[PDB]
Design a protein around this ligand. Structure first.
Ligand SMILES: CC(C)=CCC/C(C)=C/CC/C(C)=C/CC/C(C)=C/COP(=O)(O)OP(=O)(O)O
Ligand SMILES: CC(C)=CCC/C(C)=C/CC/C(C)=C/CC/C(C)=C/COP(=O)(O)OP(=O)(O)O
Ligand SMILES: CC(C)=CCC/C(C)=C/CC/C(C)=C/CC/C(C)=C/COP(=O)(O)OP(=O)(O)O
Ligand SMILES: CC(C)=CCC/C(C)=C/CC/C(C)=C/CC/C(C)=C/COP(=O)(O)OP(=O)(O)O
Ligand SMILES: CC(C)=CCC/C(C)=C/CC/C(C)=C/CC/C(C)=C/COP(=O)(O)OP(=O)(O)O
Ligand SMILES: CC(C)=CCC/C(C)=C/CC/C(C)=C/CC/C(C)=C/COP(=O)(O)OP(=O)(O)O
Ligand SMILES: [Mg+2]
Ligand SMILES: [Mg+2]
Ligand SMILES: [Mg+2]
Ligand SMILES: [Mg+2]
Ligand SMILES: [Mg+2]
Ligand SMILES: [Mg+2]
Ligand SMILES: [Mg+2]
Ligand SMILES: [Mg+2]
Ligand SMILES: [Mg+2]
Ligand SMILES: [Mg+2]
Ligand SMILES: [Mg+2]
Ligand SMILES: [Mg+2]
Lengths: 294, 287, 291, 294, 293, 293
């Protein structure tokens, strides 16, 4: 009882994040991949749970590292329970996720767990490095980073599923395109949506001072102006300053450029699904997510 | 190569390696090896894993405790920033797990998970009580310390036990030692980190817990802890009060009692001159 | 102009007189006079005395509560500063005692002292619970409200009874109305956003109001409310989450039913004292919020 | 059992200030003035209690209005229990003091309590007015206010004692001289004393931004400079700015002027005491208090 | 060459995107109807004026802690206070370099004189505000005539150095200076309808004594509200809305409008006494449209 | 009328800085160079005042741009009178100094004044740009910037003197060596100690000074210094750590040797112009900072 109550007190920040939207995409994603994997439901429930645990845990930590205010329209967990509480709680879930990952009875599972998490930390580390050392990455550099940030859990889930699946053709190429698709879509939405209130508040990325795909464009597209770089350094919440930044980004074509990149990423993804036999479920998701641009 | 990433991510950890402390961990490892006698090949990995996880947790704890100094050095997030150190410290955790996967023992990762979760339970209660303003009892407090310290204490000795025919119980001594360390650390943080950094943290340390429960007609300590202030005089006031209600003598008396329990447990396990000397060296503070 | 100092010290108080509220106080005094039938010379003194202390206490309360708006107006310390408002509000307390010394009744200062100490006890517990992070129970809260509100209510009605032949006990109703008023205030400060205070200013104060108290004890598996209250945050998004939780746990319905029950109980008490058409109407008007 | 527990919890901030030194000086004052008033111990004890209670409550409120950090070497009560709690507690003691005055069985006590209290608040208001409205007063204006701030509590004690005394000789002139002597000595010490935290912290008056006797001199003595006014507006805790201000005050002779004013106040007190029959106890007190500016 | 000038002139380039050059241009045209300045000199004078004028607004925004100018973020809100300080002072001396191309022995003399006048005006405005000393109406106007007269006199004065028109225009320049500032003061507080220039009642957040506020302060000396609100330098929308309600209720806005209406009339008469200026008359009529509502 | 009260109000921050030590070195510097230029005392006196005004004015502005707390042991002027007043006051003195330069009666004086001031603003801008855009410069880039920051006022003084001197030999190389000597010596003291600024105020400013610059490039495997500079922290313990790091990577030793080299080069340059015992003594006295004994 004391143990179960003491645990309960510690998992509260995680319980809060469970109320946020997102499981739908995670659930649909797993189903889409199983059209190829045909993996036992018994193991999947574990892998599904493990993925949800590690994913939400990373988002709890990410909100702290990004000084974000809103997530999926909800206050971020550390806005309520406090940063020291959420840090320990999220880290508790990491090793709770290993405990569940220790039940797949596959000797190669723990290896994939460790590898995928270290890969995830590499990406987040680089994003935090560039932002907090005021060094804008190049378009190529940014893309490389997300492939480790997104690729960490994408490969963790898909990989653990493949451990008990007879499908064995390489799925890393498609996962990378999707990882790009999600983050760049995330970047486009965080700055192009006004009061849609889909996930975060108005241009929360500018207040974080982070380098997202649109801002990265304007920085290199227009090396004759240092406006964006200076505005990001301010890490300000001033709406007028943020509104100016967005107008400039449109004027330099950063938003139009991002849309075409997102539009291009969708096309490549379609081919990758088709080259693996086709995935009516996975193909459908992309079309739904593609409603954001144009 | 792209190996500049590892350097970038491990810089905050590399910074903390410059701090004193490895001597105590090494001497502790050697002292327990007089009984465990683990093959050096495995032992080498065990020490590395222990040092990584210990330092990695200490990076995170300083963030959770809003601490300013550690063993006389600035905290890592005071230099590299909280976001970077968080990612780096979590990075080292899982690098440490990778290293445990080189011990080639089916029960190694099992001990790893259990001990690590045990540490998080201890930290959680320490954080929960402090951030929900509910001072624990001595029993509740000591019970928490037994998991916080026991997390890393049992990890090392446990991993050492994984490759040793010495199967005698060291947990009583491990629990006595973990208690000894924290209560000792609590005592030092207030009787000697910057001036009373624990008071600025607002944490319930062993000395403060005594006065809170000892003289319940005053809520002074509780309120001072809630302010989480950096005022030297306010901090100076608290320690004088703690001293006047005997909170420090009580901590010393508990420490002196803890010292005896360790000595008796050491002799009851055959004796460990290296260990006994180490404890004696640490026991000089409450003399 | 001789001691123009009075003007300097009374400026914050004059600022608060511009705020709505006197109507309820006037109508309340009128309703009770239907039973007490107080001499106009004495009643007028009591009315001023009541207004002074009531406004003075609200000035102090706004400071202790870090409030931003009162009845749609900036709080006085938002303009003249916290030190000035403290001194002036304490000045008005003791100006009121001077005025009570004109009621001639030897027991007036005694009534004044007791009623004021009771009000300070109520505010103290409200402050104690909030600033020592210990949520009270419903009974504990209600006991406190009966001391906070009972302080000025009993002083007014009490002073009137000193010069009245109606010697029947009115304290049960005074307590019922006091709870009614505070619990009604608690409901609105969180159920609306406009009018009086700003959006959920009580959550930013971190104080335990009736709706929050319910949610805290109703669902002991969650510490959200406690933690949100500890943040003393001004984030609208966090506050919107808090009310949503309060609504989803039924704390708002519980407050309405508690208020509706208090309204009914009041009616029973009014009739038991002969009936008071004026007072019955006041209650009915104030009850329109629970819909 | 209950309610009395509430009184204890609500009176704690007051109990904390009782640990502070000072009761001795208040006690010696009561004894010294009673050499003339010869008040019955039955009444005197309450007058002493009423005086001590209201004074400490006023010092609690004063510390909040003055953003003070230390009083008599101890942290200010609101630095421990918080401003909202101390306010309610001090005002609670105010009316607790009134309850005590209702035990003198003299009907003119309630009048005196009211009058002296209103007088004190007038002084406090003006001091706060000048400071928070950035309007330095004249020397005459400052002294006029001090006679109301000190006289409020001074007149309460001596006056209440005189209600039960056959003396009936006019003592207000002496109380006024003592009132000035006390404040000007406080003003001088808060700025001239070493970094020695005997009462308040280093030049806490400059951080308060208040117009104390020394600063008042420099402002009018040298009207070609706005240094002092500008430093007081900053309300800084910068040691270097504060040390510079004291350097300026010394160079314009403000500290010497304050000493000479205090030396005169002491001399006048001797003459005033002599004119009322003499008071060896009071003479000893002033001589002891005068050792600081000598 | 390594013209690092671009890096240093970036904050200045940022402010050129703001509206305003049109009004400065129309003023030049209106006054050239009398002065008839040679085109070669006039073009430079226009450039010198635009440089020094924008440079002063860069410095002023820092001194006034403003948030918006002409609907745009203030330059130091992006590039930072240290950069804009150095950049605006750089442009001052770039303007001096330019004024030396008029080849007039008195141009630098007039330049120095006019800039010192502007700093006297700016200093007094800053002095009263940061020493919490409200000026009297006459005192306020005297400062405005020095603040505005600084650039007004530099432009027209430099033009007159190359003009056969030698009639005194300073009386008209003073009227226009007052008209400009008081119009600005009124708009910053009465035009809550739009964020066309500054943000909502930024003058109250600056704590400056503007014409509307000055009236209420002296008109109602039994109240210290305005003074106290200005001392708070608060960004509270509710406190600001209260101040405007108070200002309107004591007639400070009506008083300001009547003063502006009078300044408009005086300007028309002064223009006619100088021969008439259809161009200038049109500008005043257009600028007078804000308070005629 | 006769309101020199405005002047007092506007010049109070400037008069405050005159109480600070510093005039002595400037006086000795003027004397050392007059041993070659031999300028009429009437012209010399004006040149000295112009230099004193412009130099002090820039330091008032510089302290604002550098968030400095102390100067020469005294609080910075804006810590007392406020940033807005000091900015306006300091810019006022610039234009007062221009007025004074108009009294040297040389047709090229204003030209030299303008040119030198633009150069100083070029240097300061580069210093601020690197700091507020978090991009450490190279040693060569830094040295080039210092030649414009110091060169502005060094060349203004010496340049103005040479306008009234028959000594027409080139002093810019020596002027540049001394400019570097002065800045790098200040950098050394701000971290290793000069009874000037507060403890490692340069770390709190986040500026790239010569010692820090070394550590940045000397050990490029570490981002410690850059990150510490970005924190813009006032923590004495963090500052003390940086100093330990700087010493352990040899940044202080490298700075000392660079200064010793500048000292020798200065002596060689001085001898090359005929010798200057006065100037040689100044360098020797200032060089005691980087000597063990
Ligand atoms: C295939 C199955 C069964 C599940 C999918 C596995 C999943 C959901 C992997 C997560 C995909 C992803 C994009 C992970 C990134 C996690 C993370 C912490 C991203 C941080 O991105 P930021 O842009 O820095 O922060 P925001 O999300 O607030 O924008
Ligand atoms: C015995 C062998 C072979 C090795 C030693 C094994 C280890 C690492 C022992 C260390 C035990 C210990 C003291 C663990 C504490 C971990 C932790 C979370 C400390 C944080 O404690 P706080 O209460 O926050 O106070 P400090 O910040 O001063 O640490
Ligand atoms: C004359 C008659 C018949 C009645 C007089 C009417 C009076 C004086 C009523 C007072 C009743 C009341 C509600 C008193 C409250 C006083 C007080 C300290 C209010 C502040 O408490 P909070 O809990 O902070 O609520 P608010 O912040 O909304 O004010
Ligand atoms: C004469 C007898 C028998 C008794 C007198 C006992 C008392 C209470 C005398 C009053 C003495 C006095 C100086 C009262 C002043 C009241 C007060 C709150 C002054 C505070 O003014 P500040 O300028 O803030 O100075 P401090 O904050 O340093 O105290
Ligand atoms: C007549 C010709 C040919 C040209 C005139 C062109 C110009 C620039 C005339 C000067 C116009 C003017 C009013 C200048 C004042 C500059 C200044 C320092 C304004 C600052 O006043 P604030 O009170 O700060 O109000 P804002 O900050 O909103 O501008
Ligand atoms: C040579 C003769 C005849 C006279 C002396 C002429 C002068 C005053 C030369 C001054 C050279 C010098 C040191 C110029 C630098 C001025 C400046 C803008 C310094 C600011 O740079 P910082 O690095 O911030 O210096 P601080 O550390 O003092 O703030
Ligand atoms: Mg992130
Ligand atoms: Mg994020
Ligand atoms: Mg901890
Ligand atoms: Mg800690
Ligand atoms: Mg309240
Ligand atoms: Mg309230
Ligand atoms: Mg005071
Ligand atoms: Mg005081
Ligand atoms: Mg301005
Ligand atoms: Mg302005
Ligand atoms: Mg600089
Ligand atoms: Mg500097």
């Amino acid at each position: 009882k004391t143990q179960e109550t003491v645990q309960r007190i510690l998992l509260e920040p995680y319980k809060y994040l469970l109320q946020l939207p997102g499981k739908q995409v995670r659930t649909k994603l797993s189903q889409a991949f199983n059209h190829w994997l045909k993996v036992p439901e018994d193991k999947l429930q574990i892998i599904i749970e493990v993925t949800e645990m590690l994913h939400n845990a990373s988002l709890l930590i990410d909100d702290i590292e990004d000084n974000s205010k809103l997530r999926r329209g909800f206050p971020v967990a550390h806005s309520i329970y406090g940063i020291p509480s959420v840090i320990n709680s999220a880290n508790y879930v990491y090793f709770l996720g290993l405990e569940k990952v220790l039940t797949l009875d596959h000797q190669d599972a723990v290896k994939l767990f460790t590898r995928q998490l270290l890969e995830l930390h590499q990406g987040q580390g680089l994003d935090i490095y560039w932002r907090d050392n005021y060094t804008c990455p190049t378009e190529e550099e940014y893309k490389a980073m997300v492939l480790q940030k997104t690729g960490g859990l994408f490969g963790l889930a898909v990989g653990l599923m493949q451990l008990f699946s007879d499908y064995k053709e390489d799925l890393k190429p498609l996962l990378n395109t999707l990882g790009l698709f999600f983050q760049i879509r995330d970047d486009y939405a965080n700055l192009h949506s006004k009061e849609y209130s889909e996930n975060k508040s108005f241009c929360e990325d500018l207040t974080e001072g982070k380098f997202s795909f649109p801002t990265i464009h304007a920085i290199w597209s227009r090396p004759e102006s240092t406006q964006v770089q200076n505005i990001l350094c301010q890490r300000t919440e001033n709406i007028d300053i943020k509104k100016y930044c967005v107008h400039y980004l449109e004027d330099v074509g950063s938003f139009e450029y991002t849309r075409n990149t997102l539009k291009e990423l969708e096309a490549k993804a379609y081919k990758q699904i088709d080259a693996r036999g086709g995935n009516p479920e996975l193909v459908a998701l992309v079309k739904h997510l593609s409603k954001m641009f144009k």
